[PDB]
């Protein structure tokens, strides 16, 4: 019985190891991705605000 | 089935009416109506004809003044032909990649390169061809500092090269990736595996230098000593020192008991042991 | 008697060895139990945090979709404007019992950890897909806004 | 006799390896938690920015409606 | 270093120039009707000075400058930028003197809720509650603010956040020795969480707390309580909490204090006890 | 291949076209410069790409535009990152100056981290790395992003204990450990920090270490149960008698049950060498 139980335990441990390696790598990649998106959206909002401000100033200058 | 015939008929009617409309400023409406006809054909799920119409719409959009729409249309047409004549899909996706790099968005270009390499490897048998695209994508990703993507691409190309019997490239790539991962605080737990793989490849050349290689890895990475892989490798080498087939068979059976060995490792293990 | 005395005293030294080894094994099992217990709370907290992050990501994707639709409409309008045991019983005694029970409990807890880890792993993939899609939506929106402003500036003169 | 208790020493020989195996897993869990938390906070910041953007877009839409309808 | 004196001097000079500009703006408007160009430019000076001060580690000056800019730009009928400046001023004051931020955030919250943007108001309410909690022990106001934020979040259908707010509310309320609210909140949260895929693993914990919070009332209504939970969530029986609670009940049934102490000591030995559980366990031991 | 020659020739042609366009004296010139720089980057001609990018940035800044100027400055800096380490620092400092002027402090925080990394890996200098890491930590803590500040402070303390007087390490370690002790998720790690601090005390003289470990044991009861406290008590007791063998035996056993980070090895070696 010793071999059965002990090998079962070791198999379980190794499986957990593998799962965690995989999804930790996944999380790291996700982190890089989110880093990019943040700056992209910030630049978008800034530029839209600036350009619409040009619009208001110009249209009020003409009117 | 009554669904396929009905959807095909509806899509054909829409595409024909779109053709009549364009044949009758007009370029923009023609492009939009052809896009709608292509969408209805895609819902009709005649992949070849839908892709043909969609690529024709893409070319007409090229006739219209815009680039982003052209590239989007090209990539969608490529995905449509994904399940058709590979050459046309490869051509369209290559044109889309060229357009995307022209704008400096290297990341999407690398993604498309990886996609075309995947289709090139699964569908056809040419492996050496896919290596070029994989290396190009790895180069772009490394240039843009996305280390994870570069590591993935390098690992894949190294595996293929190791299969192809150009072990030198495989050993270089595996050692570089392993040491770089060891340096990084995270992913360190993985490093051992890479080193182990390298040893096997280096074994194919000769047995004596394998001892020196494993000792070099031992001194470079002490933790490698406590991993089961190092014990298995040294035991296999010591057994091979005497020509008995039983010993390594028993050792591999014992190791396999815990975890099943993958196809790649099993193939190389058979190749090493048989000779 | 000297021979017997010295051999028996070596036997007593070995009895001390036996005692020390048994005690070390017991302590190691206790520490294993403690560590296995400790992992679980971190697992649970990770799970709940992941749930919350997923909900937030869905909210932001909805916001981006609304942004795109509204800006397109505005642009168009503006254009229109124009198991038995675990240890061999060499000598029995109480000390082996606690060892066996501790190993049993460790096994059970690892069994739970299996499912915990797999369930947690599942979510990340859908989160990845969602993030990938939101990038593309945002990029398209930005390109739209830039070209729209350029057109708004070119038509004037 | 000596053989039996040499065997007892063999018995205490695997428990340490097992204790190493578990100690690895625990540390890995602990390392994972921090990454999860960091991604969370960053997501909240992004969400805040998105709300600001949408609000301004809606306000600008209303202003454009005012201008076009009243001027027309 | 140089930073302190240089930043202070340059920022003071810039602020004085801005003050002179605003003083001259009235004359310019009266004599020529220049509009708001002068006022807008002055707002720009104030914002830049505030940022520079915040760089210079002089938080109070940054707060004052932000408040001045907010007041002016509100006088120019742009409520949104006024709210933004007030939010930054509150963050600035948060570090030196903890009470101006309260009123600044209150003004910002009123402005935001005027338009129905409830989520931002909820976030600001949570921040104010945290401010009350960290320095003072004026728990009552913290409970009020947390309840308001949870109400808004529930009104916006954003679940899994209202749960955390209500859990905080219950955890604090159980401290003041008024146990009904804690029991209600804990049981509701536990039964809601029972059915979620991911959250299921945590659910058990909540029940345990309720039971303990339910013990102080009278032992007889604790025993029955456990039964009602165990039949509904059979897996509860597997966890350690049920075993510990049963042993505690047995020990307390015969005034055997030593056994109760020993059991608590062992359970703490395996896992370190939190302060909240320690206080509640001592209070229960008082009997 | 065709790539090198063709891209280089077209890049020179576009640079000449942009120079001629400015010679007439404007945005068209900036776009031409940007396209030339992109194709240079494609050509693997890493150097001289940052030069074109910097030229475009200066021309763009000429017309009061500041956002795209900062973006292109940062791009040029990272382009120079591998070919010439020194210039990337100057470009990133320019970008950081502009961003800090506008108050996007998080961006300034990341660029400082990057600069300190380059000062630590390619060139050799520790003081500059410490200064830049400290500045980033201050910015982040001002914006109350606690985890980043903790990471930066931990790195600064590690380096200072590596070469400088130990006071900075003691202060940073004590503060971080005390802050982390109360938090629910992070509490399990607290021990480590405290442990490190005490070792730093040992380097000065034993009595300081004994008093410090007493104070920490009083402050954090769980510390008394840690294997680390037992190791430290044993090591101190051995050191009090001028008996090196006990020192070595205890260190070897503790290493046997768990590996050493190679920081503990250095510090334990230093302490043993001064036992005399």
Author numbering:
A (entry chain B): 197 to 259
B (entry chain H): 0 to 23, 36 to 286
C (entry chain C): 1 to 82, 130 to 204
D (entry chain A): 188 to 259
E (entry chain F): 0 to 286
F (entry chain G): 0 to 24, 38 to 288
Paper's wording?
The membrane-anchored SNARE (soluble N-ethylmaleimide-sensitive factor acceptor protein receptor) proteins provide the energy to drive membrane fusion in various cellular contexts, such as intracellular trafficking and exocytosis. Supercomplexes of NSF, α-SNAP, and either a syntaxin tetramer or one of two binary complexes of syntaxin—SNAP-25 reveal atomic details of SNARE processing and show how sequential ATP hydrolysis drives disassembly. NSF comprises three structured domains connected by flexible linkers—the adapter N-domain followed by the D1 and D2 AAA+ domains.
A representative 21bin20S model (class #5, 3.39 Å) and ɑ-SNAP—2:1 binary SNARE subcomplex model (class #13, 3.74 Å). We again performed signal subtraction and local alignment on ɑ-SNAP—SNARE sub-complexes from all five classes with ordered spire structures (see “Methods”). This procedure produced a single ɑ-SNAP—SNARE sub-complex reconstruction with an overall resolution of 3.74 Å, sufficient to assign characteristic side chains, identify the SNAREs forming the complex and their directionality. In place of synaptobrevin, a second syntaxin molecule was placed to complete the four-helix bundle with little deviation from its usual backbone configuration of the ternary complex. Sidechains comprising essential layers repack within the core of the complex compared to the ternary SNARE complex. For example, the ionic central layer (0 layer) is reorganized; Arg56 of synaptobrevin is replaced with a second Gln226 from the additional syntaxin molecule, which adopts an extended rotamer to mimic the arginine it replaces. Three ɑ-SNAP molecules bind the 2:1 binary SNARE complex; a flexible linker between SNAP-25 SN1 and SN2 blocks access by a fourth. The 2:1 binary SNARE complex forms a twisted, parallel ɑ-helical bundle with a series of characteristic SNARE complex layers preserved. This configuration also places the N-terminal portion of the linker, bearing cysteines often palmitoylated in vivo, near the membrane.
